[PDB]
Design a protein around this ligand. Structure first.
Ligand SMILES: [Ca+2]
Ligand SMILES: [Ca+2]
Lengths: 268, 146
């Protein structure tokens, strides 16, 4: 979000977040914008937008709303798409934004149906930032990885399930996939160590003697799945991630660029 | 509608009407705009807007839609408010109109709830023309006549 904001040369904008978001996620962002001397407002968006905005007009006086309108010309939404949809509509309909506004929505999880609906509801420039998964061309090969066949319900992107999957769902698939390959290699190499029946609340209880070798095998595993490549670095965490950046100035959405943490930003 | 159009100095605009409207109602209007040399398009709006506009983008090519977009900058809606609501939203969301547009809605019957909702849905200038009834001040005397 910092990189994108920097590219647009924003100096003044408002960050909107939903009622479940943990703002520690942007503590580093807030530090940096302050360090660069920007004017950044924060507001939590209640889950019922209708009473929020109605309350606003009543509560706030004219000169405040004029200040508020100006502030909304540049905004970042850090919220789930459902709340964002409702929020965008209500501000638009109540004339709190206009054609010159530019809003950014950022969330790993925004599906194609959500993106289309957000664009439909917005009336200025909109930028959408979401995580994307490297998936093959030729729709037929989308449902295979080598000889491994994936249920069409997960890989057919015309499928309602597929279009409604949570990101965690994709990772769950690849996790099962990764484990299977880990077990396979361990079995094939004839270096199997059996599972053990363990006991928890027993300060005497011992750990699984097989755990260290299994962990090492899984940790050094890698598979191609629905998320792209799943694998682990030396620190035990998946390093692979990709973000796409979508846009539309109104008057329809297109790809502006891509981001990943090694190469950085590509495109405008 | 003629008087209002004359006041705004329109020279080119499109008239949209719903599927129940009897266009003989505007035959005299059409005569007069033609006599003044205006460029006036007519289209019936089907009762399901969603398939109408979807059909449109598929059916029509680019250069037609550009012609069409330009034409929609000035429009008159001669339809019931329910159909107008849906119609305004769908054109707005599909970027067939923009901030510079000016639309007129005319119907004797458009209640206060409809008016508020139309304004909410529109994104340019909107003019609403409806019949009104002279009703007393002091809400108490509204419910009496003598
Ligand atoms: Ca739109
Ligand atoms: Ca409006």
């Amino acid at each position: 979000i910092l990189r994108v904001v920097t590219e647009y040369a924003w100096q003044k904008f408002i960050i909107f977040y939903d009622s479940e978001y943990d703002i520690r996620g942007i503590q580093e962002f807030l530090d940096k914008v302050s360090q660069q001397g920007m004017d950044v407002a924060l507001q939590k968006v209640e889950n019922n937008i209708n009473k929020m905005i109605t309350t606003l007009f009543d509560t706030m006086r004219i000169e405040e709303l004029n200040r508020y309108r100006d502030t909304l010309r540049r905004a970042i939404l850090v919220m789930n798409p459902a709340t964002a949809k409702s929020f965008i509509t209500e501000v638009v309909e109540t004339n709190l934004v206009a054609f010159d506004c530019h809003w950014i929505i950022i969330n790993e999880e925004i599906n194609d149906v959500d993106v289309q609906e957000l664009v439909r509801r917005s009336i200025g420039r909109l930028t959408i930032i979401r995580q994307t998964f490297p998936v093959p061309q030729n729709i037929s090969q989308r449902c295979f990885r080598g000889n491994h066949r994936i249920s069409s319900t997960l890989c057919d992107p015309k499928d309602p399930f597929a279009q409604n999957m949570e990101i965690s769902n994709l990772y769950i698939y690849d996790t099962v996939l990764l484990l299977a390959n880990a077990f396979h290699k361990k079995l094939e190499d004839r270096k199997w160590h059996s599972m053990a029946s363990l006991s928890c609340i027993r300060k005497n209880s011992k750990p699984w003697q097989g755990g260290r070798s299994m962990l090492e095998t899984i940790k050094k595993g890698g598979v191609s799945g629905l998320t792209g490549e799943l694998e682990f670095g030396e620190n035990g965490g998946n390093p692979n991630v990709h973000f796409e950046i979508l846009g539309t100035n109104y008057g329809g959405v297109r790809k502006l660029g891509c981001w990943n943490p090694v190469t950085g930003l590509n495109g405008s």
